[PDB]
Design a protein around this ligand. Structure first.
Ligand SMILES: [Fe+2]
Ligand SMILES: [Fe+2]
Ligand SMILES: [Zn+2]
Ligand SMILES: [Zn+2]
Ligand SMILES: [Zn+2]
Ligand SMILES: [Zn+2]
Ligand SMILES: [Zn+2]
Ligand SMILES: [Zn+2]
Ligand SMILES: [Zn+2]
Lengths: 74, 72
């Protein structure tokens, strides 16, 4: 009918947290790749990546926005 | 008549570029506040903000994607 199953946001959010847990080193590389697109260098974004890694909740929301182009609702 | 998807981006690109030229420091603050949203501390996001300022087109692209949600 009209849809009420856990939306693309709920699903992607599930996916993205499991990746962060299982292959953090791959998701770190994803952040480097995103920031490098804007001419930023490792010495500049190295500390940003390393900060996000220490903060699983922050990291999840960052990946939702910068990788998947999805905002946290409200 | 027509309202091109190209035209709206060029409209939005013009406006944003004019900001960057007239009020760069205000535009820099926009980046800092988006990064700081995700618990990245000034000592960590500062050089990224400083890196975008030195690459104006990258800076512009970064606003266009992450402030306005648009792509090329
Ligand atoms: Fe990711
Ligand atoms: Fe802006
Ligand atoms: Zn239906
Ligand atoms: Zn349907
Ligand atoms: Zn993923
Ligand atoms: Zn991934
Ligand atoms: Zn018309
Ligand atoms: Zn019209
Ligand atoms: Zn602005």
């Amino acid at each position: 009918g009209s849809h009420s199953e856990a939306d693309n946001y709920a699903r992607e959010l599930k996916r993205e947290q499991e990746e962060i847990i299982r292959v953090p080193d791959t998701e770190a590389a994803e952040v480097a790749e995103i920031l490098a697109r804007y001419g930023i260098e490792p010495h500049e974004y190295g500390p940003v990546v390393n900060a996000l890694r220490k903060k699983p909740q922050a990291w999840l929301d960052f990946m939702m926005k910068f990788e998947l182009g999805l905002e946290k609702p409200d």
